[PDB]
Amino acid sequence: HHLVPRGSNPPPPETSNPNKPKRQTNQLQYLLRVVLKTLWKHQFAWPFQQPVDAVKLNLPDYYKIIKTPMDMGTIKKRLENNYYWNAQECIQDFNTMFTNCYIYNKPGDDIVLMAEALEKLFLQKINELPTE
Numbered sequence: 654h655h656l657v658p659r660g661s662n663p664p665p666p667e668t669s670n671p672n673k674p675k676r677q678t679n680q681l682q683y684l685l686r687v688v689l690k691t692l693w694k695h696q697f698a699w700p701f702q703q704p705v706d707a708v709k710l711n712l713p714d715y716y717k718i719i720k721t722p723m724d725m726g727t728i729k730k731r732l733e734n735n736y737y738w739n740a741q742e743c744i745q746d747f748n749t750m751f752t753n754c755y756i757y758n759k760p761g762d763d764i765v766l767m768a769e770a771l772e773k774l775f776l777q778k779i780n781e782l783p784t785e
């Protein structure tokens with residue numbers, strides 16, 4: 654951990670906003686109960702379920718390169734804690750998650766194929782959102 658750089662990890666992203674008024678909506682409810690749940694169980698979801706551990710995954714420069722980390726565990730907590738004001742904010746966090754993967758990794762990488770498959774499913778599921 655000295656001679657060869659091993660990296661280090663930030664605290665995970667914030668998942669609650671104590672100042673924010675509770676505002677439940679049908680789209681946010683659908684995002685939690687259907688979209689995220691469907692994405693979570695996909696065969697390729699596991700790498701995206703928790704924050705990247707730059708040290709344990711041997712990605713020592715991950716957090717040099719990725720300034721706005723995001724993962725599905727964080728998105729799940731944000732939906733649970735009514736952190737998002739609207740569906741768009743939630744969608745933006747999914748976009749950040751996928752694009753982080755594309756930014757860090759090379760286009761031909763296995764993890765990129767996985768992210769692309771999840772992203773395609775996500776975009777399909779987004780078409781299902783209720784009419785608020």
Ligand SMILES: CCN1C(=O)c2cccc3c(S(=O)(=O)NCC4(C(=O)O)CCCC4)ccc1c23
Pocket residue numbers: 700701705710712753754757758763764767
């Ligand atoms: C989605 C967060 N994420 C990365 O961007 C990333 C890059 C490289 C490896 C890796 C991993 S890993 O568990 O070390 N390897 C995952 C796999 C790979 O070939 O990268 C191994 C089998 C499936 C994908 C988990 C989450 C990651 C990455």
